[PDB]
């Protein structure tokens, strides 16, 4: 079934990313899996694509810089790009290109610090202060500006 | 109001993180803001805490390694930890400790590759293949295992 193929895709892609990252080095998300046949599929597609992939490196760096993907907009961009990739048809090479785009997108967003986690922690902090009465306390002490007296004088 | 204090908290925390990361270096999310008074508050709290914070570095590294926070569980852990921090009362120092925990948590999750973005892209890939008929195509070509013939022979 295609639910089975979808399940297998997780192992294929994770193995693909693991082995592609190795062959290009010289991203800790990409170094951390135990697989089998699907692991072999991902490995082989990464290996045999290496010469092709490297010739595209320069322009994908320029294009991804212009796109400015973030964790917030990555889903929207991924979907539009992947839909367009397959509009005129599916073949094995375009399927591998989808894995390669996932690789490049994950790497670019992580290494440019666009993963959004600090922004997520910022929302944690604000949300906690608002809903657990910390903001109330700071307001009654005179607001954040009152902290300017700490270490002052 | 405490909605105002909550809004100000975003600038305080982002400035706090920006300046703390500078003083400890020698995370690109932490290098990327334009503020004013709240920026000054965050800067000052990071600066005057430096000697105290560094004495806690060793044990927070051990504790965060044991906790194993990820983007998936960070909210749950943040909330439990922050609630416990203030259980016996609020004071300015504990408020600063909350900003410091947010800093440490964001840094640890990013640098250990626990930000979850590759896992998010993996879900993008699987979801697209399932809902945009790519998995159907691969199934009719014999499944992912059929890709083992690419580059073979």
């Amino acid at each position: 079934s295609e639910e089975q193929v979808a399940q297998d895709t997780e192992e294929v892609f994770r193995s693909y990313v693991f082995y592609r990252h190795q062959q290009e080095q010289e991203d800790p998300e990409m170094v951390t899996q135990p697989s089998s046949t699907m692991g072999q599929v991902g490995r082989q597609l990464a290996i045999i694509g290496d010469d092709i992939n490297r010739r595209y490196d320069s322009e994908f760096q320029t294009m991804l810089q212009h796109l400015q993907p973030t964790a917030e907009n990555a889903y929207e961009y991924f979907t539009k790009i992947a839909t367009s990739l397959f509009e005129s048809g599916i073949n094995w090479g375009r399927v591998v290109a989808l894995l390669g785009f996932g690789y490049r997108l994950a790497l670019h967003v992580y290494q440019h610090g666009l993963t959004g986690f600090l922004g997520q922690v910022t929302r944690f902090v604000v949300d906690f202060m608002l809903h657990h009465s910390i903001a109330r306390w700071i307001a009654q002490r005179g607001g954040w500006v009152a902290a300017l007296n700490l270490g002052n004088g | 109001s405490e909605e105002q204090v909550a809004q100000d908290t975003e600038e305080v925390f982002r400035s706090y993180v920006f300046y703390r990361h500078q003083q400890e270096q020698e995370d690109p999310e932490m290098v990327t803001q334009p503020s004013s008074t709240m920026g000054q508050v965050g800067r000052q709290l990071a600066i005057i805490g430096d000697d105290i914070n560094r004495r806690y570095d060793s044990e927070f590294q051990t504790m965060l390694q044991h906790l194993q926070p990820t983007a998936e569980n960070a909210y749950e852990y943040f909330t439990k930890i922050a609630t416990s921090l203030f259980e016996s009362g609020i004071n300015w120092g504990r408020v600063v400790a909350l900003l410091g925990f947010g800093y440490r948590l964001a840094l640890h999750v990013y640098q250990h590759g626990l930000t979850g973005f590759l896992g998010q892209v993996t879900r993008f890939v699987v979801d697209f293949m399932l809902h945009h008929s790519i998995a159907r195509w691969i199934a009719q070509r014999g499944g992912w295992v059929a890709a083992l013939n690419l580059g073979n022979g």
Partner: peptide
């Protein structure tokens, strides 16, 4: 000029078609 996401999709397709021509035998 072409939007970045349009250009990326065009080059992904080019790349994939090169892979396909290379290996789909």
């Amino acid at each position: 000029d072409m939007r970045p996401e349009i250009r990326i999709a065009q080059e992904l397709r080019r790349x994939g078609d090169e892979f396909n021509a290379t290996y789909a035998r």
